Write a protein that binds this DNA or RNA. Sequence first.
RNA 1: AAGCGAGAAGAACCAGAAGACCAGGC
Lengths: 17, 51, 51
Amino acid sequence: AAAAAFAAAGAAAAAAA
Amino acid sequence: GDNTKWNENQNPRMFLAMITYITRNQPEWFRNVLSIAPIMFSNKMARLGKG
Amino acid sequence: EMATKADYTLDEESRARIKTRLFTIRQEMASRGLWDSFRQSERGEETIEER
RNA sequence: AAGCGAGAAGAACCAGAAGACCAGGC
């Protein structure tokens, strides 16, 4: 179903705490 | 060009000045840790060798 | 004492010995008067700056 | 697209008056 063709960068985020 | 007598002329007191400037506003302990080496080198001694 | 699913996996006498030892240390510490002191435990006094 | 040394959590952690009287606003 929902899929990412090509994901660059490290991803995630430190804002969530 | 190369620099003639580069190693012989790079005084360690200038390295201390560069470190102190670079470590401006840093915690005093960090300044100490970075500045100790130039201090010791400025007071270094050279062994002669075998003889 | 109390455990998961009410299973202690020990003979009654062994658990009795453990509970008696706990009670004895409790009474000795109370004799020392710090029972209320043991009732206090702070989160953390972590302020060790790197010097 | 980037890409030049390693991590994870022992122990255990609230308070009443009530009654009378007086002054006072509405």
